[PDB]
Design a protein around this ligand. Structure first.
Ligand code: ZN
Ligand code: ZN
Length: 367
């Protein structure tokens, strides 16, 4: 399945980010998947095999990555009085550049992509600003400057973008009166102050005696989405939890079968994470290499070989407060009885419960 392939890709990414991200980590795997899916639709041969492999689409059973992405996107684009979820894809092309009508039709149909043309050739700065400004408009202005200066030139011919936006009330809101200053330990011998929200209510909970950690599910109102938190038992237990975590174990540890309704004294910080990623080298390292060099085959975009990707950028935001949470991200592809006290490092993610998809994943290491 496509959701399962997205989680695996998510954990592959995380193992890479652990090398260059010392503190907080936060991203939208689905955003990245959706962008690179749009690329896949116009890739051929080994350019296409590499992408498929890196994203785990070679494991998606009934071309059908795309069919499935269309379902997923329709399922995600739902807002309610209690939350909003939105995911939008767009192609910005050089106004003079021609794409195959079949590539354009395919991205419109499977990825709901809107197509705009811009003047990269003579106004690349202004084109860059238009794109950044569209992203802002899709993310309640939480993702600003997705594409910084110099990642677009007069020779840029395409920018494929995914934006994802979520804002949700908690099913059980925290009382702001109960929020208090506390110590947050990023390391055993070190602390930063933090605003700690506190609540005592029941939640799905499990003790993972094996990895010496706990899991909690914190639902949004309506329960169409939840934030899941994984908290090591020890201040410094995160690395081992990180070493042990795989797609299968996550699915195992976070299924309702393996959790139980439990009264939990939940202490969760008010927090915000903003992180930017240049993914070109990360993606090459994981196996996507033709796409970025002279062996690129993106002839399914234009009728013949010649397009190469110059860049892939990702930016993500999340803020957690007493009322709920707001999370956004965007991806640009450029072509030419129990306690649960979160006062030390933890992993968290926002899950779409119906599809069982992970929309956003992160590590909170330090305010
Ligand atoms: Zn329940
Ligand atoms: Zn308490």
């Amino acid at each position: 399945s496509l959701s399962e392939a997205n989680t695996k890709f998510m954990f592959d990414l995380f193992q890479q980010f652990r090398k260059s991200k010392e503190n907080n980590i936060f991203y939208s795997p689905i955003s990245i998947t959706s962008a690179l899916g749009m690329v896949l639709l116009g890739a051929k041969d080994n350019t296409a095999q590499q992408i498929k492999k890196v994203l785990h689409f070679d494991q998606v059973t009934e071309g059908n990555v795309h069919h499935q992405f269309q379902k997923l996107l329709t399922e995600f684009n739902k807002s309610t009085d209690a939350y909003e979820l939105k995911i939008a894809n767009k192609l910005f092309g050089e106004k003079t550049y021609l794409f195959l009508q079949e590539y354009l039709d395919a991205i419109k149909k499977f990825y709901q992509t809107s197509v705009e043309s811009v003047d990269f050739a003579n106004a690349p700065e202004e084109s860059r600003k238009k794109i950044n400004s569209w992203v802002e408009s899709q993310t309640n202005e939480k993702i600003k400057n997705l594409i910084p200066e110099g990642n677009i030139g007069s020779n840029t011919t395409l920018v494929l973008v995914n934006a994802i936006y979520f804002k949700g009330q908690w099913e059980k809101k925290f009382n702001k009166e109960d929020t208090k200053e506390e110590k947050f330990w990023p390391n055993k011998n070190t602390y930063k102050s933090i605003q700690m929200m506190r609540q005592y209510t029941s939640f799905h909970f499990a003790s993972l005696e094996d990895v010496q950690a706990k899991v909690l599910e914190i639902p949004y109102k309506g329960k169409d989405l939840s934030m899941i938190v994984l908290l090591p038992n020890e201040i410094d237990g995160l690395q081992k939890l990180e070493e042990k975590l795989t797609a299968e174990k996550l699915m195992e540890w976070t299924s309702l079968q393996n959790m139980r309704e439990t009264r939990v004294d939940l202490h969760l910080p008010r927090f915000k994470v903003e992180e930017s990623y240049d993914l070109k080298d990360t993606l090459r390292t994981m196996g996507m290499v033709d796409i970025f060099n002279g062996d690129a085959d993106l002839s399914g975009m234009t009728g013949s070989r010649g397009l190469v990707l110059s860049g892939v950028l990702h930016k993500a935001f999340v803020e957690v407060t007493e009322e709920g949470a707001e999370a956004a991200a965007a991806t640009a592809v450029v072509g030419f009885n129990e306690e649960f006290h979160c006062n030390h490092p933890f992993l968290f993610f926002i899950r779409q419960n119906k599809t069982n998809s992970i929309l956003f994943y992160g590590r909170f290491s330090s305010p």
